[PDB]
């Protein structure tokens, strides 16, 4: 059902998706009872278009856990990597 998937997104020039959630992020459109970070929109031309989909829950980025992370911390981390972000996501498959 749920699986942990690894994808690597190349910045071009950013990752090309949006996130909602996080501790203090006011929730997410998918699992309201989950504090986690969720992919919310994916740019169709962008570097994440073949890799991520709305609803994916990011649990790790370049080795950093996204479990029990604040919205702003999650955003800043993703933005501060210059070139590539290896993500572990949880997806309903």
């Amino acid at each position: 059902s749920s699986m942990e998937i690894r994808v690597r997104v190349e910045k071009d020039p950013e990752l090309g998706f949006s996130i909602s959630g996080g501790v203090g992020g006011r929730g997410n459109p998918f699992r309201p009872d989950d504090d986690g970070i969720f992919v919310t929109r994916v740019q169709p031309e962008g570097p994440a278009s073949k890799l991520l989909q709305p609803g994916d829950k990011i649990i790790q980025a370049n080795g950093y856990s996204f479990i029990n992370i604040e919205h702003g911390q999650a955003v800043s981390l993703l933005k501060t990597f210059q070139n590539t972000v290896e993500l572990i996501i949880v997806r309903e498959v």
Binding site: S18, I19, S20, G25, T40, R41, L78, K79
Partner: peptide, 6 residues
């Protein structure tokens, strides 16, 4: 914010 682009 609710939704933030990265």
């Amino acid at each position: 914010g609710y939704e933030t682009w990265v």
